[PDB]
UniProtKB/Swiss-Prot annotation:
Coiled coil: none annotated. This is Bromodomain-containing protein 1. Component of some HBO1 complex composed of KAT7/HBO1, MEAF6, ING4 and BRD1/BRPF2. Component of the MOZ/MORF complex composed at least of ING5, KAT6A, KAT6B, MEAF6 and one of BRPF1, BRD1/BRPF2 and BRPF3. Interacts (via PHD-type zinc finger domain) with unmodified histone H3. Interacts (via PWWP domain) with dimethylated and trimethylated 'Lys-79' on histone H3. It comes from the Eukaryota. Residues 9-113 form the Bromo domain. Highly expressed in testis. There is a cross-link at K41 (Glycyl lysine isopeptide (Lys-Gly) (interchain with G-Cter in SUMO2)).
Length: 121
């Protein structure tokens, strides 16, 4: 149906916007602390601590399969990256501090993405 096609075009346009949002967020992590999944080889206890691991590579895989239906979904995954880190790591660590800076800086980006996703529909 043409209605199905049109919905698919909206999903594609969302995916384009989310790809640029994701690049912008990841630039706020120049140390690449959140680039890849936490390794279970190197933190074998991780899943006892953190129930839903998340990282930028995993988000990118989801995005390229057009797996985010809306910005809420995408923000949920971004928040997991930050929130997981601030629970697993202590306040006085380079990891926790990188999460705080990513949150603060990413908040600016997401504030306008929300307007762009609404605005362009």
């Amino acid at each position: 149906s043409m209605e199905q096609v049109a919905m698919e075009l909206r999903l594609t346009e969302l995916t384009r916007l989310l790809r640029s949002v994701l690049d912008q967020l990841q630039d706020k992590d120049p140390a690449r602390i959140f680039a890849q999944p936490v390794s279970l080889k190197e933190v074998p206890d991780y899943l006892d601590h953190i129930k839903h691991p998340m990282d930028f590579a995993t988000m990118r895989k989801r995005l390229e399969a057009q797996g985010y239906k809306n910005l809420h979904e995408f923000e949920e995954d971004f928040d997991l990256i930050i929130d997981n880190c601030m629970k697993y790591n202590a306040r006085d660590t380079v990891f926790y501090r990188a999460a705080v800076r990513l949150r603060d800086q990413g908040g600016v980006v997401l504030r306008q993405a929300r307007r762009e996703v609404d605005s362009i529909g």
